[PDB]
C-alpha cells in the first residue's frame, strides 16, 4: 500500500504510510512538479529529515522506483525565520538549478534578471521565492529603498530577501527574487509548498517559453490606494499609454 499525496502546486509526497496515517519512514520521497526530480529518504509525518537527490525512473503498481544521484546532496526541512534565510544559503535547489540562471536583465537599468535554461511549456514551475518572514507592519512602515524584494505571502507574512542576500555570492539556495517586473509578463507568482523551504511562492510560466528567455512577473502593486517604487510608476504610465 503506497500512497501519493499531492499539493495543489503539483509536488507530492509518496511512500508507504505508517500504522497511523503518516508519511513517516526511511523510504519516503518528495517529488517535484516535473514528476521526475525527487528528494528521497527519511521523513517524519511528512517533514523531510534527510532527503537525498534522486530521479524517479518508473512506477510499478503505483510504487515509485528511484535512482539516487551521485554525490552526497542531502536536504532537510529548514523553514526561514524573521532573521535566518537558510542554514545553507549557498546550497542551490536542484530542481531550480536545471531550469533557470541569473544574468544581466534585458530590461534597461533593471540590474540582474532570471532566465530560462531550457524550453518549457505553460504552467511550469521554474523557480522558488524563499526569504525571511516578516510582518506587513514592518514592511509598510519602512522606506521603499528597503522593499525592493518584499513579496506578500499571505495576510500575516511578507517574504523578503534583504541585502546582502540579494547577491548570488551570498545566497543562491533559491532564485525567485531575481525575476524582474513586466506588465506583459510570461510568468506569475503562485503558492508553493516546498520540502526544504516550507510554504513559499514560486515563479510559474503562463505560456511556453524558449531557452534563454527572460522570465518576468507582474509585481502587482496597488495602482489606486500608486503605492510603488518610482521605476514602476514610470512603467505603469507607459503601459497605460500603449
Amino acid at each position: 500500500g503506497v500512497c501519493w499525496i499531492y499539493y495543489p502546486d503539483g509536488g507530492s509526497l509518496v511512500g508507504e504510510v505508517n500504522e497511523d496515517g503518516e508519511m513517516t519512514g526511511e523510504k519516503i520521497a518528495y517529488v517535484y512538479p516535473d514528476e521526475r526530480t525527487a528528494l528521497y529518504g527519511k521523513f517524519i509525518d511528512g517533514e523531510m529529515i534527510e532527503g537525498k537527490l534522486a530521479t524517479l525512473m518508473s512506477t510499478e503498481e503505483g510504487r515509485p522506483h528511484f535512482e539516487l544521484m551521485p554525490g552526497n546532496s542531502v536536504y532537510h526541512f529548514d523553514k526561514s525565520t524573521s532573521s535566518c534565510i537558510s542554514t545553507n544559503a549557498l546550497l542551490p535547489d536542484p530542481y531550480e538549478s536545471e531550469r533557470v540562471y541569473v544574468a544581466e536583465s534585458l530590461i534597461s537599468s533593471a540590474g540582474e534578471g532570471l532566465f530560462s535554461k531550457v524550453a518549457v511549456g505553460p504552467n511550469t514551475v521554474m523557480s522558488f521565492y524563499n526569504g525571511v518572514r516578516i510582518t506587513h507592519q514592518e514592511v509598510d512602515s519602512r522606506d521603499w529603498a528597503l522593499n525592493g524584494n518584499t513579496l506578500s505571502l499571505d495576510e500575516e507574512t511578507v517574504i523578503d530577501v534583504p541585502e546582502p542576500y540579494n547577491h548570488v555570492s551570498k545566497y543562491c539556495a533559491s532564485l525567485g527574487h531575481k525575476a524582474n517586473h513586466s506588465f506583459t509578463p510570461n510568468c506569475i507568482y503562485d503558492m508553493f509548498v516546498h520540502p526544504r523551504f516550507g510554504p513559499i511562492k514560486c515563479i510559474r510560466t503562463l505560456r511556453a517559453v524558449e531557452a534563454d528567455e527572460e522570465l518576468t512577473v507582474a509585481y502587482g502593486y496597488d495602482h489606486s490606494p500608486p503605492e510603488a517604487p518610482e521605476w514602476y510608476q514610470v512603467e505603469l504610465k507607459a503601459f497605460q499609454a500603449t
Partner: peptide, 6 residues
C-alpha cells in the same frame, strides 16, 4: 502595501 503580489 509595500510588497509584491498582495
Amino acid at each position: 502595501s509595500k510588497s509584491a503580489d498582495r
